[PDB]
Amino acid sequence: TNTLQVKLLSKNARMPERNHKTDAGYDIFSAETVVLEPQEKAVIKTDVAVSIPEGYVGLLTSRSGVSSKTHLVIETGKIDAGFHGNLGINIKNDHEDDKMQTIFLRNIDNEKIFEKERHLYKLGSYRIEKGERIAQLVIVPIWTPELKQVEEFESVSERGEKGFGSSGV
Amino acid sequence: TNTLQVKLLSKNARMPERNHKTDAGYDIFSAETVVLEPQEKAVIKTDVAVSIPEGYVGLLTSRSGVSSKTHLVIETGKIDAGFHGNLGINIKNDHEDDKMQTIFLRNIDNEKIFEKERHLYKLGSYRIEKGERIAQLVIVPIWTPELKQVEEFESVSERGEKGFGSSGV
Amino acid sequence: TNTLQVKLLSKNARMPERNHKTDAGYDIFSAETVVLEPQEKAVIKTDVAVSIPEGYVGLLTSRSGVSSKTHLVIETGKIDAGFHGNLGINIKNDHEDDKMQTIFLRNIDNEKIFEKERHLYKLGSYRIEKGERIAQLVIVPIWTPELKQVEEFESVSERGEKGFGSSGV
Numbered sequence: 394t395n396t397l398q399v400k401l402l403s404k405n406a407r408m409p410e411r412n413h414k415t416d417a418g419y420d421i422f423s424a425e426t427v428v429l430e431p432q433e434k435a436v437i438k439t440d441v442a443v444s445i446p447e448g449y450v451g452l453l454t455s456r457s458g459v460s461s462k463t464h465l466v467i468e469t470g471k472i473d474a475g476f477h478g479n480l481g482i483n484i485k486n487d488h489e490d491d492k493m494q495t496i497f498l499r500n501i502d503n504e505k506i507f508e509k510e511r512h513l514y515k516l517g518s519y520r521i522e523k524g525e526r527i528a529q530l531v532i533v534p535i536w537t538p539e540l541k542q543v544e545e546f547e548s549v550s551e552r553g554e555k556g557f558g559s560s561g562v
Numbered sequence: 563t564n565t566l567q568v569k570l571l572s573k574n575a576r577m578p579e580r581n582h583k584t585d586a587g588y589d590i591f592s593a594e595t596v597v598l599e600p601q602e603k604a605v606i607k608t609d610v611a612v613s614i615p616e617g618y619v620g621l622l623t624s625r626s627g628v629s630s631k632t633h634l635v636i637e638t639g640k641i642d643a644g645f646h647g648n649l650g651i652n653i654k655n656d657h658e659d660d661k662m663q664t665i666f667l668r669n670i671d672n673e674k675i676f677e678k679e680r681h682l683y684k685l686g687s688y689r690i691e692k693g694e695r696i697a698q699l700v701i702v703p704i705w706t707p708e709l710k711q712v713e714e715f716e717s718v719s720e721r722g723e724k725g726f727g728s729s730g731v
Numbered sequence: 732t733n734t735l736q737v738k739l740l741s742k743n744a745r746m747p748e749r750n751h752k753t754d755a756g757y758d759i760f761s762a763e764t765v766v767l768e769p770q771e772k773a774v775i776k777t778d779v780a781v782s783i784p785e786g787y788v789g790l791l792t793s794r795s796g797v798s799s800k801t802h803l804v805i806e807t808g809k810i811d812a813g814f815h816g817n818l819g820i821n822i823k824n825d826h827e828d829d830k831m832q833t834i835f836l837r838n839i840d841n842e843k844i845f846e847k848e849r850h851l852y853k854l855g856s857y858r859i860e861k862g863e864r865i866a867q868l869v870i871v872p873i874w875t876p877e878l879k880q881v882e883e884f885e886s887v888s889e890r891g892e893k894g895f896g897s898s899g900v
């Protein structure tokens with residue numbers, strides 16, 4: 394089967410979309426408008442549910458555009474096969490709280506939003522509007538075998554136990 | 563073969579466990595109790611070694627529960643095939659050091675731990691107990707081809723060189 | 732085909748290299764020498780272009796050595812199939828700006844670099860030299876199906892809607 398079951402949970406939800414024909418992931422739309430202060434953490438609702446078949450995992454991960462330009466950090470979520478719940482974007486405004494005020498909010502383009510109302514926000518605060526693409530869903534196959542406890546492994550590897558920068562830099 | 567060789571390195575080690583029948587990763591137990599101050603970095607030992615077969619990679623990655631609730635950031639580790647060493651959780655308490663004291667430590671549920679002894683900890687400090695699931699192991703297949711230097715690619719793509727938010731937002 | 736098309740864009744570019752025979756990723760060399768202050772963000776050029784075939788994604792991701800030892804955080808980039816552009820390492824010096832001076836820069840080994848010239852740098856500043864391996868490219872297969880809007884999914888899963896630490900910890 395070359396089909397994925399996607400369910401829209403609300404009117405605020407929008408169906409994921411792939412950018413180019415040969416692209417890896419389906420861009421994820423935010424279902425809610427959230428303002429994030431420096432160091433603030435949140436799980437942004439997408440109101441989108443998927444039925445990933447067995448033997449596959451969905452990687453709910455950040456986009457290079459938003460991530461490189463803004464301080465919004467998204468933890469790559471491992472969407473289990475059969476997770477029929479509301480996909481949540483595990484997010485954090487990783488900007489430092491230097492404790493000085495500003496009068497502008499910052500959009501996902503790192504640009505200061507222009508508004509007629511006068512407000513005092515914390516510096517580094519971001520606004521994410523409903524319907525904006527802040528994430529993407531890359532679905533990769535997995536290998537889930539039966540685990541086996543052993544005293545020692547049947548063969549020696551060229552790597553051995555070497556890791557964490559054992560080679561040069 | 564539908565079997566993975568797992569070796570326990572100590573009595574503090576516990577064998578990885580999959581939550582649901584169709585889930586993606588095997589939950590990783592911590593083999594040591596560590597207290598992490600704000601901004602502090604560590605590599606937490608699991609005392610668990612795996613023999614991943616050739617053509618596959620293990621993704622030693624964070625769990626959504628711990629990551630969304632706490633300031634503990636785990637870098638997704640790429641466990642090479644044949645790495646027979648001690649799996650280390652590349653971790654950081656990404657909480658800001660605002661330089662004010664507290665009398666409670668915070669567990670992996672972001673709750674303040676109750677204890678009879680009186681101590682002064684830094685605000686944002688986390689305690690990770692031995693035997694607690696803070697990570698998971700998702701094993702995905704890989705494609706390792708022979709690299710080839712070319713003057714130019716044989717075909718043009720619809721994407722071209724476009725990237726880093728070349729589409730909208 | 733067991734071949735990947737790699738193009739070098741400049742004399743500063745170096746072709747990716749795999750550490751061990753059975754390793755997952757090809758180590759990525761930096762094409763430029765960059766000094767990163769605390770909290771500073773950048774996209775480091777590699778001057779290396781790849782032609783990943785359809786049905787695969789490249790994961791431009793951090794190395795365990797550099798990541799665990801330094802404050803340099805690299806966001807795992809999802810290199811689309813047919814992205815013929817300059818691979819950019821989405822990086823950030825996630826070290827806290829505590830606003831105190833130092834006279835040494837810090838290399839990717841977290842060691843203070845010795846130099847005859849006297850300068851005042853910010854504490855937590857890192858220097859990344861041209862030709863140093865700070866990243867790696869792990870290529871995994873993907874599953875890009877045709878999406879389908881449904882009122883409800885055809886079957887019930889044992890997981891259901893449970894997530895974000897629904898099991899224990």
Ligand SMILES: O=c1ccn([C@H]2C[C@H](O)[C@@H](COP(=O)(O)NP(=O)(O)OP(=O)(O)O)O2)c(=O)[nH]1
Binds near residue numbers: 642651
């Ligand atoms: O979080 C991690 C990451 C890696 N590892 C192990 C698995 C892997 O085989 C090894 C190093 O992986 P990488 O090649 O990705 N990092 P690095 O290039 O720094 O190590 P080396 O120089 O030995 O390849 O360390 C962990 O135990 N935990």
Ligand SMILES: O=c1ccn([C@H]2C[C@H](O)[C@@H](COP(=O)(O)NP(=O)(O)OP(=O)(O)O)O2)c(=O)[nH]1
Binds near residue numbers: 808
């Ligand atoms: O770290 C990275 C991430 C991506 N890239 C490249 C590869 C990919 O094909 C392209 C953008 O990938 P994404 O679609 O995941 N991010 P975004 O949606 O912001 O870019 P676009 O809008 O062009 O799709 O940039 C890098 O060179 N380095």
Ligand SMILES: O=c1ccn([C@H]2C[C@H](O)[C@@H](COP(=O)(O)NP(=O)(O)OP(=O)(O)O)O2)c(=O)[nH]1
Binds near residue numbers: 893895897898
């Ligand atoms: O960013 C995310 C991450 C996960 N999820 C969903 C998908 C997955 O099936 C579920 C939890 O995934 P994990 O098993 O990796 N984390 P955790 O172990 O904390 O949840 P549980 O205890 O329920 O397994 O939550 C999201 O919606 N967004």
Ligand SMILES: [Mg+2]
Binds near residue numbers: 412456
């Ligand atoms: Mg995109």
Ligand SMILES: [Mg+2]
Binds near residue numbers: 698
């Ligand atoms: Mg789990």
Ligand SMILES: [Mg+2]
Binds near residue numbers: 560750758867
């Ligand atoms: Mg390496």
Ligand code: NI
């Ligand atoms: Ni800034």
Ligand code: NI
Binds near residue numbers: 487656825
């Ligand atoms: Ni930070």
Ligand code: NI
């Ligand atoms: Ni807090």
Ligand code: NI
């Ligand atoms: Ni330090």
